[PDB]
């Protein structure tokens, strides 16, 4: 009896995946979740992280490729890998020369998810729904502070769309626009964050708890799914802003150290497969990277232009850079100030 470890973000599979695949192959599966590429990277770093197979995002992937971490993957033990699409391989292979490492899994974007009549509620029928203005301009949050704020607890993802705002590149590598201004934008608007997580805002902005959240394009579509299902009233909607924001690859791929390889291709062939992906795209309200699958998904999730983007919105999309050891320490440090901003002290 064999048993496959799987380590992959949270809200990202349909319920019965998993059940789907111990019924057809008798393989036991241990399905562990995270939220964070930090998590993530932390234990592919500091040893055995014990999975056979994990879910980072294409440019931690990138990040941490030349460690040695991943193990490449045997693409004749992956038959079904025509199906992905080609051209999205070409652009996955910026972060993984050739493919080697990586199967794409979902692509989605970083944007805004918002209770529309709250906001509406508070900031007028003209509030600015397709602007980072309706989240990080601190007149905004001031007015939104009562009914809920939250944003990511991923520095690498704040940052960048705080530099975009600025008129900044969102990559930038000047220690000085992280110290100076983003810093000095993110501690303006502190006060009226009511908290900086990335997962409990789905539940939140589905219950009517948060009003606003920097999101996960699909996360939020699942948020409002949630809230529609439950028929409470709730109106959730997401905005990719007019701005830019980050776009992304997450993709499945094998620790070097994985115990069960020949069960973990099994996992990632039966992934490639049209219809299990589609399923998962049509639970989780992510685009797949696979285009045999395209046909299947839903028309509520193919047709929704927060989830698939056309062209003008593409053309606005940023990807995250790897940053030299300068970079991260000011970034890390200045997000750690941020996060303890509303805190009391006595120096003075
Ligand atoms: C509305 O269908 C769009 C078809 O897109 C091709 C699929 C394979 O790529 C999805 C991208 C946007 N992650
Ligand atoms: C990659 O293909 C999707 C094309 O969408 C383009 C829209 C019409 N502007
Ligand atoms: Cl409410
Ligand atoms: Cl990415
Ligand atoms: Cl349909």
Redesign the pocket.
């Known amino acids: 009896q064999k048993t496959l470890h799987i380590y992959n973000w949270t809200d990202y599979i349909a319920p019965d995946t998993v059940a789907n695949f111990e019924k057809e192959t008798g393989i036991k599966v241990v399905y562990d979740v995270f939220d964070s590429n930090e998590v993530l990277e932390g234990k592919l770093m500091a040893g055995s992280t014990g999975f056979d197979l994990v879910v980072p995002?294409?440019?931690l992937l990138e990040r941490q490729l030349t460690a040695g971490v991943f193990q490449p993957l045997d693409k004749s033990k992956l038959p079904e890998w025509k199906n992905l699409d080609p051209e999205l391989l070409k652009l996955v292979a910026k972060?993984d020369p050739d493919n080697k490492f990586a199967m794409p899994y979902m692509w989605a974007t970083t944007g805004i998810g918002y209770n529309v009549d709250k906001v509406k509620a508070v900031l007028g029928e003209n509030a600015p729904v397709d602007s980072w203005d309706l989240i990080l301009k601190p007149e905004n949050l001031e007015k939104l502070k009562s009914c809920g704020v939250s944003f990511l607890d991923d520095p690498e993802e704040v940052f960048a769309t705080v530099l975009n705002y600025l008129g900044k590149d969102p990559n930038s590598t000047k220690a000085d626009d992280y110290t100076g201004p983003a810093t000095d934008l993110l501690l303006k608007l502190r006060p009226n964050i009511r908290y900086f997580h990335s997962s409990q805002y789905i539940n939140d902005l589905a219950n009517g708890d948060i009003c606003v959240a920097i999101g996960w394009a699909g996360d939020v579509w699942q948020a409002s799914n949630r809230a529609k299902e439950a028929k409470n009233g709730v109106n959730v909607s997401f905005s990719i802003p007019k701005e830019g924001a980050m776009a992304?690859?997450d993709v499945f791929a094998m620790p070097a150290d994985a115990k069960n390889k020949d069960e973990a291709y099994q996992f990632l062939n039966y992934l490639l497969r049209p219809d299990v992906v589609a399923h998962i795209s049509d639970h989780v309200f992510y685009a797949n990277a696979n285009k045999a699958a395209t046909p299947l998904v839903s028309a509520e999730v193919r047709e929704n232009p927060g989830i698939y983007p056309p062209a003008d919105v593409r053309a606005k999309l940023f990807?995250?850079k790897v940053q030299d050891p300068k970079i991260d320490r000011v970034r890390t440090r200045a997000w750690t100030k941020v996060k303890s901003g509303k805190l009391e002290h006595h120096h003075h």
């Open positions: 995002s294409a440019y972060h992304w690859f990807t995250q």
